Write a protein that binds this DNA or RNA. Structure first.
Length: 97
DNA sequence: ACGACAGATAATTTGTCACTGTACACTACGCCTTTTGTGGAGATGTCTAATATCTACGTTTTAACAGTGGCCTTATTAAATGACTTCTCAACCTTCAC
């Protein structure tokens, strides 16, 4: 279906969840989804919104973001091949070997 | 035929709640190296005014004596003394007296 992977909480909450997790993981802060959901609870109460998102949705919202943040650890480097070689000096001069 | 009305129906997400994997078990900003501009002596080099020394510059002063200049009256006659000069330095015979 056209709806697969798209949430029904809507554009405001999809942003607010992802906004809150994103600010909570810059610097050495390490705000995990549960603390975000606890913010979402606080936000709905002060927004007077009677139906805050459940923690399972918040974890499902961030699951692709978390996976994109994970993949960055794995990306492999091709390396040099064959006989021809050079080494990258900080002068910016590639010295052939 | 196809596709086109209103509604079925297989998804899709929202939300529950039993379950479990894991950290809490204190245990990084600290060990070590290098450069480096600032800083403290401390041997050494720098180089003058000045208070003489250290003779000479020569310049005064002395006395010795050398030369110029003024004065000094001149005559005669006598004396003493010392000298000089000149001249002289015979000899036989006769006569009258005892």
């Amino acid at each position: 279906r056209a709806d697969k992977g798209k949430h029904r909480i809507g554009e405001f909450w999809e942003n607010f969840i992802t906004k809150t997790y994103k600010e909570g993981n810059k610097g050495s802060k390490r705000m995990t989804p549960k603390q975000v959901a606890l913010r979402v609870e606080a936000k709905a109460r002060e927004l007077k919104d009677s139906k805050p998102p459940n923690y399972k949705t918040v974890l499902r919202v961030l699951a692709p973001i978390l996976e994109k943040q994970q993949k960055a650890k794995s990306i492999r480097s091709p390396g040099w091949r064959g006989t021809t070689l050079s080494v990258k000096t900080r002068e910016g001069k590639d010295l052939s070997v």
